[PDB]
Paper text:
The protein TON_0340 (268 amino acids) was identified in a transcriptome study aimed at identifying genes whose expression is enhanced when this organism was grown with CO as the sole carbon and energy source. The biological function of TON_0340 is unknown, and a BLAST database search shows that TON_0340 belongs to the DUF4392 superfamily (after domain of unknown function), the members of which are found in all three domains of life. To gain insights into the biochemical function of TON_0340 and its homologues, we determined the crystal structures of TON_0340 in four different forms; the apo form without a bound metal ion and the Mn2+-, Mg2+- or Ca2+-bound form, revealing that the protein has a highly conserved bi-metal binding pocket. Our analyses strongly support that TON_0340 is a novel Mn2+-dependent phosphatase.
The Ca2+ ion was chelated by Glu59, Asp61, Glu115 and Asp157 occupying the Mn2 site. As anticipated, Ca2+ exhibited single-site interaction with TON_0340 with the deduced KD of 970 nM. Notably, TON_0340 was not activated by the addition of Ca2+ or Zn2+. The intermolecular interactions, involving α1, α2 and α10, are mostly hydrophobic and quite extensive, burying a surface area of 1,202 Å2 in one subunit.
Author numbering:
A (entry chain A): 1 to 269
B (entry chain B): 2 to 8, 12 to 269
Write the structure that this text describes.
């Protein structure tokens, strides 16, 4: 099953434990997130972009996942726009994505976050190593969306992302520096994964099975990562221009994606 | 690794609870494995009612482990049913003969029926298995203190006794089919073969060498399928295991090889 694969053991015991606890109570969190996705495709706002201290530059985890979701919305007949930082918009330029401008929650049927920093209990933004993120935040539209009743989905793998507020207790207990970095920002549905991109691919894969079409087909993980890496997006863990995500090399990401495609093809028959 | 291997709904819930309970079950299984490679007895083979013929989940994993044992400089032998020996013949594995528990430094089971609370054997659909058992040597091993490792994905296999409480709470027909046979360490996975591969993957990371490199899932499964081993779910001679087609299995193996490399490099 998809939710389990996207949480494949990658050495981050903290998040694995979060996933274990989260799933014990919300076993079908992926399916529920997919149902919300599929019911609100008219105009989707996809938010991504995670500044990495000390440089505060955006990283490779998040944009690829946002791109895969954007792509699936268009293929499913809906419309999507992306809200993110400058360097990310540049990295995604080759892919022709529509960039949101002066976005207001009400203008969309759904708002999705993929690896976006969420304010912590002290109102500040922190990275996994507990360093403060110094840059204009992107979570504000989520607070407004919730106050408006606008459907929201969060995807994260660290505990400090938009949407994690929903399981803050799990993060504070299982993740290093959890009390300080855990986000308080909640979303209607939440996808926890070992790498945020995989969470986004899982949403696409689950949706694919729901509609009977493989929405991940044609996705080239290696090309996408190489392209955004060449554009300046760094690896969030190593903090260098390595063509990797969270310190994990491409063959693993490719293995996840190919396995996801195989599971979808099999499920569709 | 201990995760990827647990990717239907019933067993997924058992794994989740099992992992939550003994978070390092895969690592502890691997430790016992590496510490006792002298002469390893690998048991496998699972009669599928009503024909009582062995299936494709079990032998491949047993083969991967057999191979890993030799690559590490140890010796292995396989205890299984005749049709399984036939299917593994092309691989040249040593077959156990009049096996005595004291002769081995470790005994491992990959998808082998374990007796239930009432002393009988049951398939996942609560149908009684009627064929000479293979679990007897594990009861002797335990009493003798000989290291034992069990691998299963249903709840009715050798080794599942360690978590019968979990099996009853999530598996259909649980109270009846759940095995009471315990092993020192237990690996639970979505498919037994995958659990075995995880063992090899973890062992690989531990020794800094990809012991899975070269494993060709398609050749192995097609070969045993041709030899007569049936798919445990469909009960047909298709080249699949547990009703899951080969491309998914290949994807799991490919992912495990990549995870291993990530750790060794
Ligand atoms: Ca991440
Ligand atoms: Ca099985």
């Amino acid at each position: 099953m998809i939710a389990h694969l996207i949480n494949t053991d990658i050495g981050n015991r903290g998040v694995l434990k979060v996933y274990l606890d989260y799933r014990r109570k919300n076993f079908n969190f992926l399916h529920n997130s997919t149902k919300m996705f599929l019911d609100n495709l008219e105009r989707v706002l996809i938010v991504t972009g995670f500044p990495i201290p000390p440089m505060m530059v955006a990283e490779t985890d998040g944009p690829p996942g946002a791109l895969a979701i954007y792509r699936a919305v268009e293929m499913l007949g809906g419309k999507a726009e992306i809200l993110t930082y400058s360097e990310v918009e540049k990295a995604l330029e080759p892919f022709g994505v529509s960039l949101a401008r002066t976005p207001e929650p009400e203008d969309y049927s759904l708002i999705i976050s993929v690896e976006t920093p969420g304010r912590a209990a002290d109102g500040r933004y922190y990275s996994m190593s507990a360093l403060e993120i110094k840059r204009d935040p992107l979570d504000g539209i989520f607070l407004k969306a919730r106050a408006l009743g606008i459907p929201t989905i969060g995807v994260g793998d660290g505990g400090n992302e938009i949407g994690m507020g929903k399981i803050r207790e799990l993060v504070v207990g299982h993740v290093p520096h959890g009390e300080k970095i855990a986000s308080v920002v909640e979303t209607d549905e939440l996808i926890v994964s070992a790498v945020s991109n995989w969470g986004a691919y899982g949403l696409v894969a689950q949706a694919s099975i729901e509609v009977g079409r493989n929405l991940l087909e044609g996705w080239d993980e290696r090309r996408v990562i190489e392209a955004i890496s060449s554009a300046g997006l760094i690896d969030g863990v190593s903090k260098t221009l390595a063509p990797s995500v969270d310190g994990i090399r491409l063959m693993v990401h490719e293995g996840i994606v190919e396995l996801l495609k195989a599971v979808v093809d099999e499920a569709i028959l």
